[model samples]
Target: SGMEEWNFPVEYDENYLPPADSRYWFPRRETMPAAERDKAILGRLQQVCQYAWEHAPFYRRKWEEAGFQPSQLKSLEDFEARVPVVKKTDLRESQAAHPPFGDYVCVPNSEIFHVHGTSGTTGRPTAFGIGRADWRAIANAHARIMWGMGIRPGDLVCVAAVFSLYMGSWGALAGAERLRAKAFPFGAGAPGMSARLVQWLDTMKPAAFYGTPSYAIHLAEVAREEKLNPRNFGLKCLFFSGEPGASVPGVKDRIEEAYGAKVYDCGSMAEMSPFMNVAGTEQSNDGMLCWQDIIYTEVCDPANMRRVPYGQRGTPVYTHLERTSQPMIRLLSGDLTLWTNDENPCGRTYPRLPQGIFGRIDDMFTIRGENIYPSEIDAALNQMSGYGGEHRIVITRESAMDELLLRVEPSESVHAAGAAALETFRTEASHRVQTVLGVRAKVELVAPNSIARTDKARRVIDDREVFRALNQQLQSS
Candidate 1:
């Protein structure tokens, strides 16, 4: 019953900026030595633990069962060893139990500032309760990284993404405003917004654009069809989130070619709002860098929960150092990726995801006991000849074994209608999938522009789970 006023992450100098002739937005914090940053991160981590332990029943009950508390968390190792990681399902279940904000939420109803979340996955959603200070922290955090991507104060950063409860678009919009940029939050999914976006981009010539790689490519293709070169958008920076195409070699190359701008790949989970914490700057190579200071990340083995050594495959476990409201301490993001601690061109001293987020562990389909990432299949298609904008990867169980069915459209250049050429194209596509992914696919060549280009739900249809359930029920009957 003792809820003392928690006033940490106190407000200070939200508008403070370094003088001209600086690469970093906050030079001191951006370039702080990795070791020193770890200390600072640890202190913040400890504070969150104690704060949660005192206020949040969710963390208290969870920590109590583990037979440890904040005092025992002497080092990061000790903290990792003892504290159990929270997952999306955990939050979903907690929200179901407590309703709305969930038991895990640290702040009280009076102090809760904003409520947002990922929607429609489950009947209930993963909600977020952000404090006012948390908003400022996210703003500053995003501004810092946006600056690293070369988004200057006065430059216009186009927020060409959905404005609904999706935090990605809002964060980019808010972060752009916080960075003191002329934020052009031209919302997506409106009737013919792409047509209007092209017209506005031609006139306004915005300096930066933020959207999913799928939308960016779709928009670019639209502009080209209208006889307007997408490069005329005048975007110096095009950072992406909510999807993985921006980081894929062929996909990244495609966008850069269309817009004539440096494509930046970024983000992890929405729980880490300012999800761009893993985004790469223009100078950074290989993949996006993880800004560990904002959110201390652990790439942990799913089996043992130990932090995997760099250069290995693992999912990310995140703990927010700044988030006081709805603080996600040791939250497990069900994403699979490869990370590296190698120094990057941005020189922020943060660990990098050299290949960016490979894909979600949840999204990976077990095809005959061999794991297949949708991005790997998508990327494979992007490099192959006669590739199109839309390719559907539909997995259906044929009796006991699963089959990979590819319903693909050829590029406008290819004559896919001719019988002989169509057969050859199909044969080559099947071979490409087999050689690259180590899995055979049955390829079906469709007409050019056959698959409708919709921004959201742009293809990968895995009917395995639903079909499996049907099979089990039928057998029981």
Candidate 2:
């Protein structure tokens, strides 16, 4: 009913609309002027803030502790300055104290239409409820993202993400259906899953494929193993989320080459529903375009929590306008991004994040006073010729000094070369790491696929006691 209310061109309609219909969801709002858009965002911010303060005790207590009231928000600057940023830890702690859905659940249980949980990649999984009204809002947000990526009516999309308790697959399915596209709900990592995916591609010949970048690359590897050409499947597009590969140039090129399709990157949050940002029609390796109307995007200084100007890397902050079940106001996303207000070639005026997500601010580390991020190492590997895409950053301590170990695999071309050639490539990779990352690292080459690629790949493995100690210190302070 919500999808119908939004006028999403679905299969039920006798007239099928093209996938690139920008005006299908909201005909005028997508291209609204900045002044009007900003005014609208401030209005939603004021409304949601008041609602969260009145309905959710967690926000009420937080707001009071900050010595602020929702009614005091006179301008957008006042809202940003007075309203404190909410962190994932705050939500996690609230849930830990309350159990299951924390005080963050703003709606009644009877009104909740669905429940999804975080992947718990870092720690405990927190449950999120989607109210009936919010479910439609989430679907509409995702629909806008998919439509921007050229998802049209009558398109058969193979959804390769898992749908069980995870938001990735559910968001993909919702967005696809909203576009009037036929969805193939194939969850990942089943028995003979690769074979099944190949069969679907061979027989059904879908127009698009959606999954994480690692899973997508793994599928291509499986197809090659079975002597099947993925390009023969006739997939026009490959959309990626839940991982970083689509924004990484080397990995992006690799996936595109494997499937012979265009690669578009998307991003989402667990507390907030999926489809926060999507790659515009004119794609760039920098990042995806932020949906300004629905999600008020901000890049702020992690130290003082002040909003930073465009072109500088900072922590991402989001305020959800469509979220009814659980509204996030000035929610501090630990992800790092470089944002710009410049318009894309497609003429969409919404703020764009060209660099997409750089890496997690929490995942950053310092060695010998040199700041290092796993993604920086990832970009370096992507630039090298012989090194494969799969890698892991191993941080260990030796004799009270920190050492970074770069574990990577040689590509098939390098593997075929003699031992001398392998040594030469390894040395080249080590030097490249030093030059790019500004850290001295020992390179260890492992067999291809030894690092293990899963749904969400862990890029760094820190075994040092000092690193753990620092993490604990940060959490405590």
Candidate 3:
């Protein structure tokens, strides 16, 4: 009857107190030494690998094709060498073979508590199934990152993201509950989201705001139009995700100045839970700390798939550990980052990804055999004095060659300087763009606030509309 007498505590000790300035959610696990952490991770990797081989038919076929067995994994090297990386298309293919959800889902459909997915902006979105345990893990993960950002119990937080199927809103809400914060689920859709948000700011006076950077800026614009200053609402902090705006210095500065709050950035995927990467309040400007225990991360050269040396830019590959509904192993997440093993002064030993995500590998394009990212143009515009922070990059093919056109607005002073001065500002901006981006671009001076704002800002417009149309015609023919 010893088994019947055994009872494992289901909840964390309520009376166990932690330090006020503690930098970690799980201090012991977060600060584990490299060797010990590797051992533990390898052990879990083996267990998960074997579990997938036995339970998931999709992984079994892939493993057999690679002539690999879970039993062959004796060390981390063995696992890495034997297990090949999986692309997003592979999951798509799996789902196509098996309609609805794929065999990548390890749990029964009856056990599924929630279903969410990517926005499918580029192509078909991957489906994510979350069981009850997975939901708790996601909430706890988000809470840990938020606590690092100075969110504590009883803090009044306002979540201004879309609530339907988007993981961002749900993650923020779940994390707020875990932190015991009073959260207002102000959805960013249907029936005047911005207007309702401004009203909440005036009435509730929440301490923190959570949403995409674009929406955050849009809210500030709305507040200004309503004869109210966002800073006057007493927002203590602003947390941003879903865009690179939070990591850009000019954007971060503008948002912080507009709201009179500290800005922090976090990164996540729909397949994996939010809080896979979190920026500590102290290291807000540097980068986010990747949760090594939760997701086994590897930064590899995008072209060769070889692990890059520290400080080099590479694509991130993630393997999920704390999920049952779906378990992703060696999943190639096309996010580009400069990962480093360098020690962070924040006192947590988790692997730090400096500058968070630099850019997307797919977002890169070639100009005259030179690789360039939209972030480069963004950096160039921010560095220029005559240009306002808002601009749009339009890429098109002219005379069978790729051409870039930068439509930018002049600064307030330049705008007031009249037509000739605005033209001069345009020339100056073009020079700055060429100097910084190392490529010539046609610069057009547009009026202030000419670029339209949406729920998410669109900075790049590639002339793929014509190409897609032509391709469709060809296919039909």
Candidate 4:
């Protein structure tokens, strides 16, 4: 009452600034409009594109075949039309022909600062090179985005994602260091395992956590086994990039509820070294904001590589404005989402993925004319009260009609209940799947721990093609 009496009303409003306005590391850069930032984007592209063309044989040869010259990149449209997207398959083939980092390795091996490779799920692992300059750029980029997520100095950040040959953990580890936060890279297993990580995790509580959505949820399972309170871990914020759970409504709410912290969704691709390119912010506190100035991001048609206008859906293609070592001019991310140029609460002018990453374009599979994304199915399962952590999405052809089977485990609470409870749980799950996913699925209430998640989670399997065709009509459709 005393403060209200002394306060000036209308005069204070003009010079007033929202609390979010002061949160940026570089305010001017982020606040600039997307249109104004493009001038600078084109400027950076001119330099980096020419550098890649002159130095990297792969870039130069590829551009020559496309009839695109660095000199022709005057306008954004010209650049888009001329520049071809560098796909993962293309990189693999280039590396195969050139032995190691491919002919597109801009920096020499002597200048290569750190090396990381994508998982060799497909034959040989394709290793990516990072120059000393690029590493610092990544640190700066990640730190900037981390700062936007309300991460402050002196905070402890425990990186719990895979780090061996992966870039996800390393990006965060370096970013936290550069951000002046204590970066503990335990690599999900803690430097040792469940005991050591649990010991340290409780000992020095982290203010921030970085990992896949599944691992964090999986960690909760481990913590319960160790009799540790996951909510008492002192995590203020949890940021994820790997899977869809981080951004999905129910799943995000689940982690937020489980850890008692705000969960941020972030990630692009390993090729985009500053992989936190698409990350959620603390402003709107939802969805990933495209930091276009930092990374030249374009939501484009996956087929034609043409830029899809704002307020539409497309796969994201990224180009490095900051990275130098092996500056990816236009690396296509197979992931899909919607982008909007709408203003954000944070006042960042970069376009935003208001819906966040749904999943890869190819991940959306069709069955019985119903399109399904595993992440959404995962999301729906998370929302259910009796949901177990593990689920197997199996699609098979039964006689003539296709059968969608969801083999899921019940939580300990639900599993321990009577057989009637299991029946109720099954109906709930089946109904939830049908309501959200637009397909009626037969949910199998499996025994807890029966659905083992030993290695990387391989859940969805469409065996319709594996079986003999029921008829030519079935094959034709």
lDDT tens string, model 2, 8-103?
111123243434534334545666677777876777788888888878899999999999898898888887788899987798888888766788
Residue pairs with backbone atoms closer than 3 Å in model 2 (clashes): 19-152, 286-354, 286-355, 287-354, 287-356
- Provide the clashing-pair count of each candidate structure: 0, 5, 0, 0
lDDT of 3 by residue, 1-477 (tens): 111111111123323334666766667666677667778778778888887887788999998998989889898777667788887778878877875668878777887888876532222445777777677767766776787777777888898877876677898898888778897788775657787679779888888888877567778888988888798877888887765556666567778888988888776566667543545454544567777767778787767566788877778887776666678888877877777877777666776776666446566543422335676677667776777768888877543235788899888888888889898988888886765554577899777878776654668766733244532542453
In candidate 1, which residue ranges exceed 4 Å CA deviation?
A: 1-7, 364-477
TM for every model, in the order presented, reads: 0.76, 0.73, 0.72, 0.73
How does residue 1 of candidate 3 score in lDDT? 17
Position 5, candidate 2: lDDT: 26
lDDT digits (tens) for residues 1-477 of candidate 4: 111111101011212222444677667678866666787778778888888887888899889999999999998898778899887778888889986788888777897988887642224557888887678778877887899998877899999766677788899988898888888888753434755676677788899999877567667767777888888889999998755657666567868987899999998877887988888888857889988766789899887888999888888989987766767888987777789988899888778998687545566554432346676788788887898788998877553335789999998889788788889999988887776654467888788778877565668876754223322332342
Local distance difference test, candidate 1: 0.76
Report lDDT per candidate.
0.76, 0.72, 0.71, 0.76
Better candidate by lDDT, 1 or 2: 1
Q: Estimate, for each residue in 226-270, the C-alpha lDDT of model 1 and write its tens digit.
A: 788788878897998875567776667878888988989888777
Candidate 1 lowest-lDDT run of ten: 1-10
